[PDB]
Design a protein around this ligand. Structure first.
Ligand SMILES: Nc1ncnc2c1ncn2[C@@H]1O[C@H](COP(=O)(O)OP(=O)(O)O)[C@@H](O)[C@H]1O
Lengths: 225, 261, 225, 261
């Protein structure tokens, strides 16, 4: 009996595909089929020549070694265990908005990585989605296997400390928190603060590809008397 | 703030009635047959029909198990009540049967259960409610997943009821209505009253009892002939007051193996 | 009581001549009696020169140093503790079969290692043996230490991940799992769900070299076409 | 229930074939060369291969004498047929000759009978079956006592068979789990009636009884003087209704070994 197959199939399509790519790419990179030096998002190479090969893959790639196994494991664990939780709430019947948000965050993070020198654009996206989930679930008593009474909207800073003490590259996670805050301010707080038209409008292309699932009334019978 | 009241057991078995004392109705300007809104814990809300009763005191409000479960409150707690005569007749309601009651029925649910229950009743309903209907040999439980208008609506003869769809799984909040409560015990009024008296404070407000500095009872010996319903009494008390009932069996502990028992 | 002698005698035949071997070859390397440079299975010299001693000896040696002994110890422990199970059940009444499958595994692994540029050989063969045992004993329940309830047909993948995250060198377990799965098809699954003719028949000279048990149901014959 | 089927005489004499009408195979979605399971009375099972026949009626199944003996039925009876696509290729079997067929043969049975019969035959067989082989001058009867895997297998060219052993008798011990039923009980009319009344429903139709929601009996105490044959009563009831009667003796459970009982 394929427990793994059923567990994979119960996952939502968005996060199943994201998780599958994020797990598959590092194995291919380490396996030696393609040299890892071809996927690092070098700013000068992209600036001078076109080099459309490495603007996107550096997000999904990670050169795992015997120094960062724990970091990789905890990052993928949090990604898997919070993407589904975000799916259950908020964007529960509107996956198009979810793709819109992820694309917005990815474009902002790749632009700021073009400006800065960071090479592996995988942690910041997870940090941004975790930050937005924490900020959209405030005043909730969160507790992991040993957490006693940890409060919400503080987990991003706890993982900030955890990642800073275990490893380094604090700039990427700060900029991830920054882009998450920017999206949260411009998506939900903007209409209730200024009342203007939503600048974050999803075009109809995603609706064509991913139409939102509405109610299914079915057939009914009049009660009468 | 003359609106906070304490809940208590009910005598009427209808799922949309609450018993009140006449002085409270006079004070709150509530007339018989009016529909009122109830607010409780976890920001859950319900609607009820007010009925006058002499037995209940002014400070106590009588309600059955289904309404208390909907409000997610236990006996002796505090709730909020307000009037709301602005209810409008509904257009159409979508209901579904909870999965863990409908195992093996294979038939048309609307005619058997819903039509007799909803006929000439004018029961107010709200989105997300759970209501229990007695049937042939089971007690089905239905959930409302969609209504129009939302949330307040009244079931009227001119209504298109949709009840077709995949059965809903459990909410995972428990509150299974198939458990045992104070309504499932009969012929033991005095002893149940004594137990409910001297178990309540140590399990409801432990902080106040610790602050007072008074020794609570530590053991109770229920003795009687076998088959008179003692385990049922203990389970009902545990499920009503709210606890972590843990059953230890005699023969299980006795002959486990030699020394490690 | 000489526990060494009694324990050695209690060990079944074939493993008794394998286990000791793989704990005796490294000593010669570590004491420096024989130069380790002649014990690394260099493929190009094997192709050009004769170098017949390379495959037989390079599959039994592993250099041990500062902190690489733990993997050797755990691999040897698994080898013993599961080869005893593999001989006592399934491949029990066919001493030749337990040896024919080992030679088939060895031939396949040396072929694929000559194709690749891998140095050592015992680890993929151990993984192949463990996998061919695990695929035969599905629907069991075991636990290593932390009260975990993994069922079966997962332990090879679990230890694959364990070796992967803690360190690296992932190719030399996939290359063993693939060979084990190929053997499982070519031995059990293929001529049992379709009816194809057997391609792995143990030669009679192995039976005359090593006798078999006495079957409960007397002796049997092959039908054929 | 389009599974009950009346029996009829066979046209072809092959052991492992049953003749089916075309609409029946269309209705059940069965194709030629596949395997099906035949179940009847006395908890007897068989495996067979579906074959086509225009002459045979839809409700009639054409089938020979050996399968009738295996299923312990007769003409005019009813047999249930079910699909079985998970038939599993065999590895080794053990076959023995019946006592009253090998009188004055004194030869090797592997090549005279078994090899001609089993070549390119693809005949599925089950444990405990009895089958006949026609050869030189005697109809040799053979019994299958084990198969790998059990109990379903298909004879294949790359399989090993064992037929070396003493000629086994016909039944020996196969009567306790057999014809014994209501016809072999005396002086228990009222008690047998009560047992049949309170045991028939929870064993013949368990799904319906579960669906209704009524507790089934969990214990019965047959008490009386020794030697009246109560174990025969229980065996008859189990063998008639259809169950897996599992006898447990007292003394053997008691003195097994200290604490392993
Ligand atoms: N009011 C009641 N008084 C006594 N028994 C009842 C009552 N209501 C139900 N029962 C029955 O009592 C049974 C449980 O008895 P139990 O507590 O196990 O007896 P004992 O305490 O002797 O073990 C239930 O199966 C239920 O049918």
């Amino acid at each position: 009996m394929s427990d793994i197959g059923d567990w994979f199939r119960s996952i939502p399509a968005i996060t199943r595909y994201w998780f599958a790519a994020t797990v598959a790419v590092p194995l291919v990179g380490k396996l030696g089929l393609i040299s890892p030096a071809y996927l690092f998002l070098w700013p000068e190479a992209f600036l001078y020549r076109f080099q459309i090969w490495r603007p996107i893959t550096a997000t999904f790639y990670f050169p795992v070694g015997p120094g960062t196994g724990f970091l990789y494991l905890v990052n993928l664990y949090f990604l898997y265990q919070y993407s589904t939780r975000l799916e259950t709430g908020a964007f529960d019947g509107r996956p198009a908005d979810y793709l819109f948000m992820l694309l917005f965050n990815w474009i902002c993070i790749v632009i700021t990585g073009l400006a800065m020198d960071m090479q592996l654009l995988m942690i910041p996206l997870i940090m941004s989605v975790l930050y937005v989930w924490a900020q959209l679930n405030r005043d909730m008593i969160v507790s992991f296997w040993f957490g006693t009474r940890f409060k919400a909207c503080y987990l991003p800073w706890v993982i900030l400390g955890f990642n800073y003490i275990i490893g380094g590259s604090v700039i990427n996670e700060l900029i991830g928190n920054l882009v998450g805050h920017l999206y949260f301010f411009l998506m939900f707080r903007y209409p209730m603060d200024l009342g203007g038209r939503n600048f974050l409008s999803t075009p109809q292309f995603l609706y064509r590809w991913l139409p939102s699932r509405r109610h299914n009334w079915g057939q009914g019978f009049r009660l009468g008397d | 703030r003359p609106n906070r009241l304490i809940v208590d057991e009910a005598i009427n078995e209808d799922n949309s009635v609450v018993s009140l004392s006449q002085p409270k109705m006079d004070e709150l300007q509530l007339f018989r047959g009016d529909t009122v809104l109830l607010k409780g814990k976890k920001r859950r809300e319900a609607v009820c029909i007010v009925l006058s009763d002499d037995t209940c005191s002014d400070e106590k409000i009588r309600m059955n198990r289904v309404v208390r479960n909907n409000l997610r409150v236990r006996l002796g707690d505090v709730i909020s009540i307000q009037p709301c005569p602005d209810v409008k007749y509904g257009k159409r309601i979508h209901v579904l049967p909870i999965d863990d009651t409908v195992e093996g029925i294979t038939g048309n649910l609307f005619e058997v259960y819903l039509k007799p229950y909803f006929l000439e009743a004018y029961r107010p309903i709200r989105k997300g409610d759970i209501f229990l209907v007695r049937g042939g040999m089971r007690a089905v439980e239905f959930k409302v997943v969609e209504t129009d208008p939302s949330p307040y609506c009244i079931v009227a003869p001119d209504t298109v009821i949709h009840c077709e769809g995949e059965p809903i799984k459990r909410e995972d909040e428990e509150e299974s209505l198939n458990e045992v409560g104070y309504d499932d015990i009969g012929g033991c009024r005095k002893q149940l009253a004594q137990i409910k008296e001297m178990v309540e404070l140590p399990l409801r407000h432990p902080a106040l009892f610790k602050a007072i500095g008074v020794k609570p009872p530590r053991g109770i010996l229920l003795y009687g002939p076998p088959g008179t319903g003692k385990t049922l009494i203990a389970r009902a008390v545990a499920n009503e007051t709210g606890a972590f009932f843990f059953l230890i069996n005699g023969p299980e502990i006795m002959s486990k193996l030699a020394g490690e028992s």
